Scaffold this active site. Structure first.
Site, PDB file in Angstrom:
ATOM      1  N   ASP A  91       0.841  -1.183   0.000  1.00 23.45           N
ATOM      2  CA  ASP A  91       0.000   0.000   0.000  1.00 23.45           C
ATOM      3  C   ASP A  91       0.876   1.233   0.000  1.00 23.45           C
ATOM      4  OD1 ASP A  91      -1.776   2.083   0.454  1.00 23.45           O
ATOM      5  OD2 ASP A  91      -3.065   0.896   1.776  1.00 23.45           O
ATOM      6  N   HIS A 108      -3.384  -1.065  -2.031  1.00 17.57           N
ATOM      7  CA  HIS A 108      -4.328  -0.321  -1.258  1.00 17.57           C
ATOM      8  C   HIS A 108      -5.733  -0.835  -1.351  1.00 17.57           C
ATOM      9  CE1 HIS A 108      -6.055   2.985   1.046  1.00 17.57           C
ATOM     10  NE2 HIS A 108      -6.844   3.315   0.008  1.00 17.57           N
TER      11      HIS A 108
END
Length: 233
Positions: free
Chosen positions: A171, A202
């Site tokens: 992420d 993400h």
């Protein structure tokens, strides 16, 4: 999409709609879902339906209603992503927590409620989920992929009920130093769990996203349902 006629009022008189899924059987615990920056959209509809299939009632409030009521943006469209980022830039986090606290109170008093309420947040909603966990008005909290958790570590000792967080190991919002800070800070309070999904980005749990990772989403979602199950009965 929202459920016509549903209106929830917050601490300051602001009112907002919600998508509500009644449970298959009554009574049932109710899960308040804190949406992403994109609003109450197809992924939220999917999430409501999933939780209802799993033995919950669900309420997804319209958290953008202070700026733009009925926001429901499709992440496939560049123009709609841009709309979402503009909304996030201006989003009032404290008012969001208040709106979520109002939705939780609303959820608690639904006619089929078994008295137990959970809160599951995604992205924007996952950051709000941590803040609600610190406030303590809710029985269990789950947050997927929240941004900026490393700046909220002062709140770790305030969390007095279980909270579970799923975070992508790839992420870009949570680079290595941030992950180390969150891991070490959250580790101090055994009411918190934070799980990292190596190789997942993400939006690893959002079906249709280029970030989606089936194996990671599966494990996270399985953990979520096992963590929520104690609210049932």
């Amino acid at each position: 999409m929202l459920t016509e006629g549903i209106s929830i009022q917050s601490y300051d008189g602001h009112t907002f709609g919600a998508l509500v899924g009644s449970p298959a059987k009554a009574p049932a615990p109710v899960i308040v879902i804190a949406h992403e920056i994109l609003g109450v959209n197809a992924f939220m509809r999917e999430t409501v339906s999933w939780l209802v299939d799993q033995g919950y009632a669900a309420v997804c409030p319209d958290l953008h209603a202070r700026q733009a009521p009925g926001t429901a943006l499709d992440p496939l469209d560049e123009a709609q992503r841009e709309q979402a980022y503009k909304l996030w830039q201006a989003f009032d986090m404290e008012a969001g927590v208040g709106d979520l606290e109002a939705a939780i109170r609303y959820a608690r008093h639904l006619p089929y409620s078994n008295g137990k309420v959970g809160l599951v947040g995604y992205s924007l909603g996952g950051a709000l989920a941590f803040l609600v966990a610190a406030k303590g008005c809710v029985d269990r909290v789950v947050g997927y992929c929240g941004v900026g958790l490393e700046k909220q570590l002062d709140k770790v000792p305030e969390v007095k009920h279980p909270a579970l967080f799923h975070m992508g190991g790839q992420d870009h919002f949570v680079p290595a130093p941030s992950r180390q800070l969150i891991t070490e800070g959250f580790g101090a309070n055994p009411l918190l769990q934070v799980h990292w999904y190596e190789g997942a980005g993400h939006s690893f749990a959002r079906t249709g996203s280029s970030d989606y990772v089936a194996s990671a989403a599966a494990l996270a979602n399985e953990r979520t349902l096992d963590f929520l199950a104690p609210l049932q009965g």
